[PDB]
Enzyme design. Sequence first.
Site, PDB file in Angstrom:
ATOM      1  N   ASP A  83       0.735  -1.057  -0.107  1.00  0.00           N
ATOM      2  CA  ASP A  83       0.077   0.102  -0.094  1.00  0.00           C
ATOM      3  C   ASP A  83       0.838   1.161  -0.183  1.00  0.00           C
ATOM      4  OD1 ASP A  83      -2.670   1.466  -0.100  1.00  0.00           O
ATOM      5  OD2 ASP A  83      -3.035   0.724   1.832  1.00  0.00           O
ATOM      6  N   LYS A  84       0.269   2.383  -0.140  1.00  0.00           N
ATOM      7  CA  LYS A  84       0.870   3.791  -0.034  1.00  0.00           C
ATOM      8  C   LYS A  84       0.095   4.680   0.953  1.00  0.00           C
ATOM      9  CE  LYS A  84      -0.317   7.347  -2.598  1.00  0.00           C
ATOM     10  NZ  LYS A  84      -1.252   8.615  -2.353  1.00  0.00           N
ATOM     11  N   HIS A  85       0.746   5.470   1.560  1.00  0.00           N
ATOM     12  CA  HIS A  85      -0.159   6.459   2.353  1.00  0.00           C
ATOM     13  C   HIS A  85       0.705   7.927   2.052  1.00  0.00           C
ATOM     14  CE1 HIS A  85      -2.918   8.206   4.885  1.00  0.00           C
ATOM     15  NE2 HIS A  85      -1.875   8.854   5.680  1.00  0.00           N
ATOM     16  N   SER A  86      -0.174   8.950   1.833  1.00  0.00           N
ATOM     17  CA  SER A  86       0.181  10.214   1.731  1.00  0.00           C
ATOM     18  C   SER A  86      -0.029  11.127   2.909  1.00  0.00           C
ATOM     19  CB  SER A  86      -0.334  10.896   0.498  1.00  0.00           C
ATOM     20  OG  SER A  86       0.147  12.401   0.365  1.00  0.00           O
ATOM     21  N   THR A 123      -8.853  11.095  -0.827  1.00  0.00           N
ATOM     22  CA  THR A 123      -9.353  10.140  -1.864  1.00  0.00           C
ATOM     23  C   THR A 123     -10.593   9.483  -1.743  1.00  0.00           C
ATOM     24  OG1 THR A 123      -6.909   9.684  -1.938  1.00  0.00           O
ATOM     25  CG2 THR A 123      -8.450   8.099  -2.873  1.00  0.00           C
ATOM     26  N   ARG A 171      -6.766  14.893  20.276  1.00  0.00           N
ATOM     27  CA  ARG A 171      -5.506  15.777  19.854  1.00  0.00           C
ATOM     28  C   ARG A 171      -5.777  16.920  18.909  1.00  0.00           C
ATOM     29  NH1 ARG A 171      -2.698  11.842  16.062  1.00  0.00           N
ATOM     30  NH2 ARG A 171      -1.284  13.395  15.562  1.00  0.00           N
ATOM     31  N   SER A 186      -0.392   7.133  14.574  1.00  0.00           N
ATOM     32  CA  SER A 186      -1.635   7.345  14.025  1.00  0.00           C
ATOM     33  C   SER A 186      -1.730   6.806  12.735  1.00  0.00           C
ATOM     34  CB  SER A 186      -2.162   8.700  14.134  1.00  0.00           C
ATOM     35  OG  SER A 186      -3.507   8.943  13.713  1.00  0.00           O
ATOM     36  N   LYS A 190      -3.366   2.568  11.339  1.00  0.00           N
ATOM     37  CA  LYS A 190      -4.386   2.254  10.481  1.00  0.00           C
ATOM     38  C   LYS A 190      -3.738   1.373   9.276  1.00  0.00           C
ATOM     39  CE  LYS A 190      -6.107   6.851  10.873  1.00  0.00           C
ATOM     40  NZ  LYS A 190      -4.853   7.218  10.787  1.00  0.00           N
ATOM     41  N   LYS A 191      -2.548   1.758   8.614  1.00  0.00           N
ATOM     42  CA  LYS A 191      -2.022   1.260   7.432  1.00  0.00           C
ATOM     43  C   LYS A 191      -1.566  -0.426   7.955  1.00  0.00           C
ATOM     44  CE  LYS A 191      -2.340   2.934   4.159  1.00  0.00           C
ATOM     45  NZ  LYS A 191      -3.502   3.152   3.389  1.00  0.00           N
TER      46      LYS A 191
END
Lengths: 440, 440
Positions: A83-86, A123, A171, A186, A190-191
């Site tokens: 996967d990818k996260h930005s 997204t 937060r 955080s 999730k990922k």
Amino acid sequence: LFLAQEIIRKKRDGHALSDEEIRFFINGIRDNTISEGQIAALAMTIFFHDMTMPERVSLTMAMRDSGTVLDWKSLHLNGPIVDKHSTGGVGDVTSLMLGPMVAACGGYIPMISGRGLGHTGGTLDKLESIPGFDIFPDDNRFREIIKDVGVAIIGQTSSLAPADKRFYATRDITATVDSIPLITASILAKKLAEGLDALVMDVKVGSGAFMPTYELSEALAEAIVGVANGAGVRTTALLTDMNQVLASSAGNAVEVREAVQFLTGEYRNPRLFDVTMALCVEMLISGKLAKDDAEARAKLQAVLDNGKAAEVFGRMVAAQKGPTDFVENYAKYLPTAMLTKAVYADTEGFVSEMDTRALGMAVVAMGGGRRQASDTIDYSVGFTDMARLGDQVDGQRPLAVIHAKDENNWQEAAKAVKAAIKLADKAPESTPTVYRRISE
Amino acid sequence: LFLAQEIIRKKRDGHALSDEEIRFFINGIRDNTISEGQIAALAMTIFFHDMTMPERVSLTMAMRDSGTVLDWKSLHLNGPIVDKHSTGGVGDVTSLMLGPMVAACGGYIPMISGRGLGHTGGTLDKLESIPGFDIFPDDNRFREIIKDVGVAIIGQTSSLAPADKRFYATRDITATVDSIPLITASILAKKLAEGLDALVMDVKVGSGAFMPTYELSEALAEAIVGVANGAGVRTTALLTDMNQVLASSAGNAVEVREAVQFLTGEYRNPRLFDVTMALCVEMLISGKLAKDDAEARAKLQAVLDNGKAAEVFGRMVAAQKGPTDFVENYAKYLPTAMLTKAVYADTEGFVSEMDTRALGMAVVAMGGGRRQASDTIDYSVGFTDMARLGDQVDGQRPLAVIHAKDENNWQEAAKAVKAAIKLADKAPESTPTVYRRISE
């Protein structure tokens, strides 16, 4: 006992917390036995004292384990889970092409993404411009789509890293968002709950980025890379440019159109291409689908050239209950705005500075994003034909084309676009789209 | 906006808060628009960064002004409005004699006191051992009692410094009690709401004290004295000893009995006398009822000697709906315990160390105090005939006489008393009861 206050005091007084203490505290957030005041207090002690590597790892794992963690072994797929996260941006549409591209190359991408936040697009909100597109398939259906299509893009259910929900909510009202250990935990909670073999992180740098300086963007990337690799997920990060809009568009439907036109080869913004390709390359290498950059790039270019990536996107959209003929007929499905009109600069010159935070906020103000959770999005509004840094603007080249929901809205958007962009008599010095790669 | 998070961030990043910001935040606590998480976050930023004198003053005044503030001018009394506050202790019964003594000398004492907290007794709980005694007279009645009797001892109503209520409740679960600026503001918010001309603060030092070291006890006293004087209330502090029980008793009914016997001259613990007198002296001088220590002491001794102070106590008890013949007949009214029996040391020797925190907790465990707010007190239980440091103990001198609610309870109390007290072959070095006086 109980231990929550004692744990706050321990961290308050500069001691490192044990794995057991961190797990107890995270559980207590999950099951609602630890109060908002206590969450905020701990968050602030972490802001002031930071966390060591073992603490950061413990925090991340505890948050990951607070809910459902996906496992893919039992499907017996013949490819890596990647996967990818930005960190987010404006025109940061990479996932819509990257998911299908990597899937077409043999990867499996269970992408749990997000809605827009602050000035940044999301997204999931972009995907929800597609009529019928379902970001919440049930467990068995999600697994079917991953197995059959190779990729799906979904929302965060109430069962996924639930401790992160109240932690982030607290937060976000107590000035404790801005902490590298908390941000890291955080993101990865999730990922990592996706059951990944490999991950790539896109950490933005510049005026439309999350971290304020390059050094802090760097520090965040190193932390995420360190923690994820320690968890057995092969992870790298790219620091990429957000000193202007990445795609040629910003919004929802407009960005989906750009994604489709990119996949079909009608049009490819070269900076969006560079970032998308670079992130895909990391995924193929970390996922052991290619041995080097050159091999990865050849494979990824191939699935663009032969239409396989576009086909995967079409199959993903259909599988998630969007139209079966979406790639071919997207024009009929994506909503058009009431008024679409170019905005021109007041003077001639070179685009020299563009405040991407302000551009992002202009899209929110247009109705293309939210100021509060209950806000409803207009999926048609936003910008296309974005001028780039170094573009000469005049009567034959607007700053952007604005898609607006009515004429009053257009006027305000035009004011904001002009205010966000500075011109100069000379073009600014060119800058890399990818500044550097961080690996274990 | 809104400003609560911005104010937290400002303090978080080491800046001083303005009066306006502090007032806004305190108001927001009062009217429930600022959350527990936000209160805790600010409290923690104050723990880490402290507060300057102007900030401490602003915080105190804002909390004072969050509710009802009493004014005495309109009664046209011919005497100063004066009070005492203590950080608390074990056998810290001074208020029961001090109020009547100072009233008999021409002062007016609107004493808003408290219940027991942690290991410490509470004046209101002691008073509630007196049948019918009403700690919550209405506004008009409280004023009548002050005018007619000179003194009343009452509880904190929901209208008095209400911002302090949620602030303290949050501090007490988030490890943010231990902050000199927060402690100072909390104490003075309540006392300054009494509309005082003058105030004396009793800051305890030793094993049964609030602050951990002498230096921090000192630092707290200086802060309270500084803030109160800045508010136009003539204030001094005494640092007094809590390395043993102050009275000869600890509990509720037992301490009320000691107070009566002190006022009538039957018995006066000399250390309790020294502290009580010293605090009363401060009140007379600050209240301009005497010009020096010698004059103040003569006036206070006089009202003890002629029975006037005892008379005022009787009139106070009657005015607050206790029995009209209480001083004369207290034995009939104060509840007696099921079992009263001496506890002897296991060995002969000199009392050398007594852990006053442990003694206080033993009274709680006996049922004489609370572990949670809903707990019900047994008003009869506790200790009398306390041995003092330097007392030779043997078969003719017990460590204490324990008043217990049943025999099982007695056995546990006896175990705790013995565990809390160390003996030596030599008496410990004597120590002052009053270590020093802090003035503006």
